[PDB]
Amino acid sequence: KNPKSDKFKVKRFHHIEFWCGDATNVARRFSWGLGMRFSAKSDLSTGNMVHASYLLTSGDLRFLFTAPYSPSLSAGEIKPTTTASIPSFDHGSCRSFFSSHGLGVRAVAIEVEDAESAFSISVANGAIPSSPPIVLNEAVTIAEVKLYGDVVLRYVSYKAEFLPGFERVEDASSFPLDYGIRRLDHAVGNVPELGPALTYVAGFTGFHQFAEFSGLNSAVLASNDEMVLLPINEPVHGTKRKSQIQTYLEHNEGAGLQHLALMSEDIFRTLREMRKRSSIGGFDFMPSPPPTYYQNLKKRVGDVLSDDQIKECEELGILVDRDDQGTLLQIFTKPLGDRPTIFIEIIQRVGCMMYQSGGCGGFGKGNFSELFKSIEEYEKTL
Amino acid sequence: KNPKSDKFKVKRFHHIEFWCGDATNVARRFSWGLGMRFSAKSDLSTGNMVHASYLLTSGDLRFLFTAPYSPSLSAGEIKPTTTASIPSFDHGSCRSFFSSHGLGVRAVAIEVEDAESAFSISVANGAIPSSPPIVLNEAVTIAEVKLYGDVVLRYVSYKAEFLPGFERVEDASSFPLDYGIRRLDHAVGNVPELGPALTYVAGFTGFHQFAEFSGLNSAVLASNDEMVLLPINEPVHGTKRKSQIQTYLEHNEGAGLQHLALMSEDIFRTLREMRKRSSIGGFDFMPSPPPTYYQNLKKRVGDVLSDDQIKECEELGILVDRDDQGTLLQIFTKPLGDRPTIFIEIIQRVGCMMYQSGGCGGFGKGNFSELFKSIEEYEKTL
Ligand SMILES: Cc1ccccc1-n1c(=O)c2c(C)c(C(=O)c3c(C)nn(C)c3O)ccc2n(C)c1=O
Ligand SMILES: Cc1ccccc1-n1c(=O)c2c(C)c(C(=O)c3c(C)nn(C)c3O)ccc2n(C)c1=O
Ligand SMILES: [Co+2]
Numbered sequence: 001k002n003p004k005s006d007k008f009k010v011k012r013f014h015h016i017e018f019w020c021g022d023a024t025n026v027a028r029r030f031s032w033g034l035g036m037r038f039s040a041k042s043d044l045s046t047g048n049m050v051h052a053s054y055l056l057t058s059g060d061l062r063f064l065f066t067a068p069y070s071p072s073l074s075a076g077e078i079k080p081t082t083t084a085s086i087p088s089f090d091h092g093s094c095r096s097f098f099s100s101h102g103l104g105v106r107a108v109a110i111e112v113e114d115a116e117s118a119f120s121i122s123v124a125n126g127a128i129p130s131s132p133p134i135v136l137n138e139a140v141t142i143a144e145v146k147l148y149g150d151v152v153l154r155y156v157s158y159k160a161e162f163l164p165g166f167e168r169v170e171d172a173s174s175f176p177l178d179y180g181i182r183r184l185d186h187a188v189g190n191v192p193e194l195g196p197a198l199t200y201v202a203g204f205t206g207f208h209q210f211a212e213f214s215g216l217n218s219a220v221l222a223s224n225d226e227m228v229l230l231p232i233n234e235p236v237h238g239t240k241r242k243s244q245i246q247t248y249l250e251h252n253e254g255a256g257l258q259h260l261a262l263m264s265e266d267i268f269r270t271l272r273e274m275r276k277r278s279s280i281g282g283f284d285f286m287p288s289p290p291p292t293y294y295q296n297l298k299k300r301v302g303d304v305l306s307d308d309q310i311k312e313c314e315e316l317g318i319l320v321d322r323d324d325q326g327t328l329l330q331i332f333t334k335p336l337g338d339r340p341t342i343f344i345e346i347i348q349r350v351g352c353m354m355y356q357s358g359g360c361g362g363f364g365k366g367n368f369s370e371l372f373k374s375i376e377e378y379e380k381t382l
Numbered sequence: 383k384n385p386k387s388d389k390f391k392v393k394r395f396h397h398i399e400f401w402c403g404d405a406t407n408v409a410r411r412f413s414w415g416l417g418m419r420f421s422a423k424s425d426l427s428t429g430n431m432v433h434a435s436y437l438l439t440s441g442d443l444r445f446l447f448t449a450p451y452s453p454s455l456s457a458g459e460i461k462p463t464t465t466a467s468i469p470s471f472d473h474g475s476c477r478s479f480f481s482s483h484g485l486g487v488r489a490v491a492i493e494v495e496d497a498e499s500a501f502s503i504s505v506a507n508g509a510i511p512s513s514p515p516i517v518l519n520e521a522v523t524i525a526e527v528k529l530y531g532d533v534v535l536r537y538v539s540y541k542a543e544f545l546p547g548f549e550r551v552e553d554a555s556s557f558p559l560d561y562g563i564r565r566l567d568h569a570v571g572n573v574p575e576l577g578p579a580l581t582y583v584a585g586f587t588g589f590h591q592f593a594e595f596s597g598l599n600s601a602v603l604a605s606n607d608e609m610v611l612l613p614i615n616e617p618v619h620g621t622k623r624k625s626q627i628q629t630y631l632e633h634n635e636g637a638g639l640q641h642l643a644l645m646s647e648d649i650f651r652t653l654r655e656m657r658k659r660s661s662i663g664g665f666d667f668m669p670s671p672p673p674t675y676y677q678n679l680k681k682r683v684g685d686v687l688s689d690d691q692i693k694e695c696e697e698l699g700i701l702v703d704r705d706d707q708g709t710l711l712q713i714f715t716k717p718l719g720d721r722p723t724i725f726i727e728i729i730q731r732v733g734c735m736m737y738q739s740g741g742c743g744g745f746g747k748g749n750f751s752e753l754f755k756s757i758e759e760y761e762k763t764l
């Protein structure tokens with residue numbers, strides 16, 4: 001059931017911003033590892049004396065990487081005179097964020113009809129303000145409220161390219177990399193207590209619980225058309241294997257963004273390209289499930305995937321799960337940086353045509369049982 | 383003239399350590415951009431709860447990338463019980479270094495006969511102690527003294543692989559990249575005042591001035607066999623073009639390491655490989671000199687380089703300079719990170735055979751006049 005109770009008009013995910021120590025090196029690593037193009041910048045060369053911000057794009061997916069310059073470069077500025085292109089940026093906040101959490105997501109940005117109204121309505125409905133609505137060049141409005149931990153939900157609205165003050169990147173510096181990633185499917189937070197997290201966010205957005213069908217309890221919040229999907233997890237304590245949600249909280253110094261799920265228009269091509277680059281600057285993937293898992297896929301999705309398409313999942317280490325409505329193909333990277341905290345999921349969904357509905361096939365929770373069973377079965381092959 | 387006045391026995395450059403916010407992303411970017419292999423690690427997977435350190439190698443060149451974990455992981459430790467593999471590491475120092483300077487070199491490490499003796503003699507001769515000699519697994523001794531700004535000169539000595547507590551990297555994660563870089567040729571510091579810098583370092587090392595033949599004054603300190611080369615620059619104020627040394631000091635928040643010169647056994651192959659990767663995660667190079675500069679190379683080095691080898695310099699943007707003793711081929715990257723501070727020089731020297739003597743061909747200061755003249759000449763072609 002979908003009560004369509006969004007308290008303001010929400011459009012789509014707009015971008016994800018990472019707070020970095022050095023935005024150049026993270027952005028270049030991510031660009032090569034994920035096949036994302038350099039498309040905009042805001043830095044010293046554009047007159048920004050406060051922060052360096054570099055935007056990567058793949059299809060509709062936008063990754064922003066920001067790091068502070070020396071505060072001495074902007075010591076004469078005040079907010080009315082700032083050269084920052086993102087007026088919510090603060091040297092002290094950014095340094096404290098990164099020292100506390102390491103590399104990670106600071107902002108989950110969604111495009112809304114009216115960022116001022118969304119901010120007002122959100123805070124009137126319990127949201128903790130983080131940055132008030134600011135109108136940029138009478139063209140775009142940005143505002144921020146707290147989501148969980150030190151992560152903010154950023155609202156952006158456009159009267160009618162990324163943000164004012166950003167410059168398009170010269171073609172020579174903009175190699176047209178593309179491994180097939182096209183948009184952000186969902187963004188997942190880890191918290192110590194799921195109940196209060198859910199009630200807070202569902203409180204100020206009006207997002208509703210999206211229906212499903214180890215070591216965690218989880219729930220998914222969704223916008224009216226269920227295109228914005230914000231799952232949240234809490235750990236389950238006492239298990240024989242320590243909860244990965246608890247390990248995240250310990251190494252992250254508390255709540256924060258756990259994984260970003262990126263939709264590919266061709267998950268086979270995406271994984272082939274990403275795996276060729278794993279050991280030459282790109283991203284590593286979690287261990288592949290045992291061949292038993294792939295021997296068990298025929299009985300589960302053999303009506304959706306050919307044996308040749310099932311063989312390709314096996315070569316690439318892809319997992320498969322299924323709802324009553326659609327099928328999901330997914331795989332997880334190892335952590336993106338030093339700490340066992342944030343990682344990336346690559347996904348592709350099949351089914352639920354009308355365009356495709358959001359969350360088609362679920363999020364893969366059925367793979368816990370399938371993996372465990374596959375692992376006992378591989379142990380029995382022995 | 384070489385008075386061979388080293389106060390302790392110095393062998394070779396051993397490694398360069400960068401202090402990072404995220405060592406994983408910088409190390410992966412550098413590995414792909416420079417063609418360096420992942421060869422050792424010290425991190426959570428090796429029992430280090432304090433810092434993540436990843437070592438890249440190309441030939442004899444060793445780049446170490448280190449970032450701190452959350453202090454909470456090691457809050458119960460004391461120095462006698464530490465899990466850090468580099469006992470000089472300190473969370474607070476590393477965070478303050480990176481927040482102050484951004485990404486840059488913390489340690490210039492040289493292998494010495496006896497790190498305890500080198501540290502003792504250095505401090506007895508004016509060096510500011512940074513970290514006392516520590517013996518690791520009764521196998522290697524490390525000690526550190528201040529070099530300039532927040533950069534330390536690190537001594538390492540071996541009784542008889544990198545450091546104890548580091549683990550060799552699994553072959554699967556160790557792709558054998560190689561673009562021809564083989565060793566560190568020199569490491570250059572920028573300071574506000576050259577005189578006191580030179581006197582301090584020459585004071586405690588016994589390193590002597592190495593003889594030569596805009597916007598800077600410079601001098602080179604060398605070890606007995608002149609294989610360790612530590613140039614230092616200060617700005618020249620008042621020039622019509624602002625000194626790049628002064629720009630460095632402003633953005634770096636003071637003195638620090640300006641450039642690392644990496645010797646290639648085949649600078650043509652190195653530059654071809656690095657330039658193919660500039661826009662797909664690697665390093666960018668400074669603008670190429672005008673074709674006039676290459677039309678002027680025949681008259682200057684036409685006895686050393688074929689016209690086909692001179693054409694290859696032109697395709698790759700390589701600069702050429704010459705001493706009374708040897709010839710130098712060199713090129714400079716754009717800054718390695720967000721700030722216009724540290725950059726890399728790729729070099730190859732020809733001449734001075736006996737093995738090759740250090741500094742063969744100088745350091746390229748003759749290219750200031752050659753570039754300027756070439757630029758006026760290209761303007762005249764018009
Ligand atoms: C626990 C663990 C330790 C080490 C290596 C992998 C894993 N591991 C996963 O991490 C995992 C994730 C993140 C999702 C996910 O993407 C998700 C969930 C669940 N709920 N929602 C809303 C999502 O988006 C779905 C299945 C997963 N399986 C089966 C699994 O084994
Ligand atoms: C100033 C500047 C602004 C923007 C773009 C490039 C440049 N630029 C250089 O940066 C430069 C360097 C660093 C060296 C060097 O490597 C060095 C020196 C000098 N002394 N020692 C001991 C060295 O090792 C040699 C020649 C150079 N030329 C000719 C030049 O134009
Ligand atoms: Co997911």
Ligand SMILES: [Co+2]
Binds near residue numbers: 745
């Ligand atoms: Co040089």
